Amino acid sequence: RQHLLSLTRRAQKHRLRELKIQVKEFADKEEGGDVKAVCLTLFLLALRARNEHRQADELEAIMQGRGSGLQPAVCLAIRVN
DNA sequence: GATCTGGCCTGTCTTACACAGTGATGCAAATCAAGTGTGAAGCCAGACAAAAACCCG
Numbered sequence A: 001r002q003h004l005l006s007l008t009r010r011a012q013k014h015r016l017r018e019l020k021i022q023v024k025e026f027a028d029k030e031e032g033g034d035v036k037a038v039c040l041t042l043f044l045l046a047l048r049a050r051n052e053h054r055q056a057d058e059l060e061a062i063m064q065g066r067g068s069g070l071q072p073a074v075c076l077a078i079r080v081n
Numbered sequence B: 001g002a003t004c005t006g007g008c009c010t011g012t013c014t015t016a017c018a019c020a021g022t023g024a025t026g027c028a029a030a031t032c033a034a035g036t037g038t039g040a041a042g043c044c045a046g047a048c049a050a051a052a053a054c055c056c057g
Helices: A009-015 A017-030 A036-048 A053-063 A072-080
Strands: none
Touching (some): A009 A017, A017 A036, A036 A053
């Protein structure tokens, strides 16, 4: 009810229960059973309102499996060679 | 007896059998560290007007 960095996982849960309600219903009725992409783009927009295309591109990269992730074939290459 | 020949003995000669990987130095290239005011690529403005993909008489 006060802040969120100190509010725990379920404290935040009870804080935005109704946020979750609306977002899940709208998502799984509009995108035909999906919440990942809609919450993804929601956070992208709500952070890009502060024109932080650096973090936007970084998050789109981690969603695209390229950057600070080392896809398992790469780590396997390193362990072998 | 005298010699022939065949067997064994070395004796050379042929191909082959394990070196790139270690930690160190040492130069060349990159960057980067400030200065300070720029413009440029998007941001987003609620609301409005020309195209691709597919429904529809």
